[PDB]
Structure 1
Amino acid sequence: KCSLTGKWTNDLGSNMTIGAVNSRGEFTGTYTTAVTATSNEIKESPLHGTENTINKRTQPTFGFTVNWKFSESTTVFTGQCFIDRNGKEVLKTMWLLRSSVNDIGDDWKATRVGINIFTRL
């Protein structure tokens, strides 16, 4: 079965640690990003997410939110826990990074879209 619980690392170099996901399929962890869109000083931020358990799947669909402690932005990732053809766990995730604009008119450019493959760290 693919499991979210553990230390992971991604193609960018950010590390993330998810804990035991309870019955409700919920979990928490911490995210130490390696890069930032803000020239602010990076700090390990909290992560609180959730995984799907409808048909107690082996390679479950999930999604979590990162509360950025060093910026006013938020980031959400959705992905799936896969067991790659080489027998190892990989998380293919896609994210949306929302920035904080002032007047509602600037909103058209407050969202970035990207990829991230997390491997067991």
Structure 2
Amino acid sequence: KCSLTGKWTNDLGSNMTIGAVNSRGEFTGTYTTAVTATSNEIKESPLHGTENTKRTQPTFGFTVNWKFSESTTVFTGQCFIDRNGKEVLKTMWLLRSSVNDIGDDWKATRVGINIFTRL
């Protein structure tokens, strides 16, 4: 029992809202980040993702298409039943900044973790 639908808050402070997961595992939702590496308005954004499909703790993966910037973030993790019986999503992401030349690409990728809980 680890539905992906719902509202979740992360260690960095953000909030993530996911909808009803279908049969092929997909889903959609909004993701208000609580942190920014830019100078723009922290404006909400939609995230698209899929979750494997029969174990209780399935690994998923989604893309959050930010609205206030030319960037994308990709999280990938697994739904765990944190010992007592509370769900906990541990994930990792790659923050893709945008450049102008096919040269300054390396300085474009950032990596970090993120633990989500049911806010």
Please report the TM-score for the alignment, with normalisation by the length of structure 2. 0.98
In 2, the alpha carbon distance for the partners of 1:66 and 1:43 equals: 12
* Residue 49 (structure 1) shift: 0.4
Aligned length: 119
In 1, the alpha carbon distance for the partners of 2:85 and 2:55 equals: 17
In 2, the alpha carbon distance for the partners of 1:73 and 1:34 equals: 16
SS of residue paired to 1:105: coil
Please, which runs of 5 or more residues in structure 2 have no aligned partner? none
* Residue 86 (structure 1) shift: 2.2
* Residue 85 (structure 1) shift: 1.1
Residues 91-119 of structure 1 show CA distances to partners (whole Å, capped at 9, x for unaligned) of: 00100000000001100110000010000
In 2, the alpha carbon distance for the partners of 1:57 and 1:20 equals: 18
Tell me the residue number matched to 2:5.
Answer: 5
In 1, the alpha carbon distance for the partners of 2:55 and 2:74 equals: 22
SS of residue paired to 1:109: helix
* Residue 57 (structure 1) shift: 1.6
Percentage of identical aligned residues:
100
* Residue 17 (structure 1) shift: 0.5
In 2, the alpha carbon distance for the partners of 1:83 and 1:42 equals: 31
In 2, the alpha carbon distance for the partners of 1:4 and 1:16 equals: 11
What's the Cα RMSD here? 0.6
* Residue 34 (structure 1) shift: 0.5
